[PDB]
Design a protein around this ligand. Structure first.
Ligand SMILES: Cc1c(C2(c3ccc(C(F)(F)F)nc3)CC2)c[nH]c1C(=O)N[C@H](C)c1cc(C#N)[nH]n1
Ligand SMILES: Cc1cc2nc3c(=O)[nH]c(=O)nc-3n(C[C@H](O)[C@H](O)[C@H](O)COP(=O)(O)O)c2cc1C
Ligand SMILES: O=C(O)c1cc(=O)[nH]c(=O)[nH]1
Length: 372
């Protein structure tokens, strides 16, 4: 029964890794297991009452893996088959990059938190597109992958002056293979990137990305799950004042963005002892309340018209329901996969289903935004 994500040995190995093994080595080992298709899997049917959707994107369950986990799309099949409905690969950039100097990633098991200053390390858009094409070809031959969704997060190379040039580059090379495109204007580890959340710049960014996507048609096209043009999401940073949030919401309404990923990591958490004096953004349990509150704010600023993808401190079914009731349609995990490991998706799906039973919901969609 080594196939089973909850097999008792995985927790034993993970507890040991979390105590004694460098975080990036742990992540390399995970990707290596996925590379050779030797991760455990759960290909069981998911509850039809916990499915969700953003526009025509039909998620078989409400849990994906956030960006920055499989940056290069080399582990798509194996991560999905842990029990996730979708994965967001990237963030990718036109040219490859090795990222900031190491050590750059630190975990705090006690607070279930991570800090990272990675700096968009990836193989580059051209190589990651090849990896994603290989996955799409396997998907065409495997019915157990036919409904899974793959988004691509796109960004700029560190030295690029005009972000839009790099975003267009990625659209023109990988867009036809993506179910959605996530515009990353919120990493704290690329200088000047978050300035693109200013309303004027963001409006131009969104309109340019949508135009480039819309032009792919003009010049079987969609080799993705939906067989439709990718939806466009924006991923937002939680470190904004109220004026900025409202101005962003106005832009998202005017530009007809399909979804907002709330949120990226935060630079404002100061009370993790082992992280004192370290650069980078914080993920995990200490991000939950900040990011849930941000969901409530943006859900209201956008008048409930822009679907929300929740990211930040989601570990339990209860955390997931907090995000959904605050306004999210679907949830992304990252820190949960680090600290809970192979069982993450099976466990959290079970917890959420029981909570929907207990709370009286007919289905998950009934819960979206119920706090408001
Ligand atoms: C602990 C962990 C793991 C798991 C793991 C690894 C190895 C094994 C083994 F089979 F070997 F025991 N079991 C489970 C629990 C799933 C994956 N990832 C991490 C991790 O700590 N990732 C850090 C935050 C990271 C992130 C980045 C980037 N981008 N770089 N580094
Ligand atoms: C090591 C690491 C690398 C990440 N890289 C990316 C990235 O490339 N693009 C992105 O949009 N988010 C990236 N993130 C942010 C995560 O996708 C996620 O939004 C964040 O960790 C909050 O979710 P969590 O609290 O569940 O971990 C990264 C996070 C970590 C910890
Ligand atoms: O590449 C990174 O450093 C990174 C990107 C991002 O968007 N978020 C994050 O926390 N790290």
């Amino acid at each position: 029964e080594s196939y089973n994500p909850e097999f008792f040995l995985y927790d034993i190995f993970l507890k040991f890794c979390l105590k004694y093994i460098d975080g990036e080595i742990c992540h390399d080992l995970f990707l290596l297991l996925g590379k050779y298709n030797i991760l455990p899997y759960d290909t069981s049917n998911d509850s039809i009452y916990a499915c969700t959707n953003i526009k025509h994107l039909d998620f078989i369950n409400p849990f994906g893996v956030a960006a920055g986990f499989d940056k290069n799309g080399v582990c798509i099949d194996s991560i999905l088959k842990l029990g996730f409905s979708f994965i967001e690969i990237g963030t990718i950039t036109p040219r490859g990059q090795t990222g900031n100097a190491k050590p750059r990633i630190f975990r705090d098991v006690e607070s279930r938190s991570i800090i990272n200053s990675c700096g968009f390390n990836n193989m580059g858009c051209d190589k990651v597109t090849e990896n994603l094409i290989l996955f799409r070809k396997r998907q065409e031959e495997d019915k157990l992958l036919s409904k899974h969704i793959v988004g691509v997060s796109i960004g700029k190379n560190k030295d690029t002056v005009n972000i839009v040039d790099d975003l267009k580059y990625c659209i023109n090379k990988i867009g036809r293979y993506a179910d959605y495109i996530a515009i990353n204007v919120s990493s704290p580890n690329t200088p000047g990137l978050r300035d693109n959340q200013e309303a004027g710049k963001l409006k131009n960014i969104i309109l340019s990305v949508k135009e480039e996507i819309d032009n792919l048609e003009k010049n079987f096209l969609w080799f993705n799950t939906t067989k439709k043009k990718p939806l466009v999401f924006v991923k937002l940073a939680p470190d904004l004042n109220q004026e900025q949030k409202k101005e962003i919401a106005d832009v998202l309404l005017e530009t007809n963005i399909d979804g907002m990923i709330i949120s990226n990591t935060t630079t404002q958490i100061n009370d993790i002892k082992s992280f004192e004096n370290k650069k980078g953004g914080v993920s995990g349990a200490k991000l939950k309340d900040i990011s849930t509150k941000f969901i409530c704010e943006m859900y209201n600023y956008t008048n409930k018209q822009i679907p929300i993808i929740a990211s930040g401190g989601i570990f339990s079914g209860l955390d997931a329901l907090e995000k959904i009731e605050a306004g999210a349609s679907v949830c992304q995990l990252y820190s949960c996969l680090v600290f809970n490991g192979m069982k993450s998706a099976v466990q959290i799906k079970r917890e959420l289903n029981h909570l929907l039973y207990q709370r009286g919901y007919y289905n998950l969609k009934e819960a979206i935004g119920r706090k408001h």
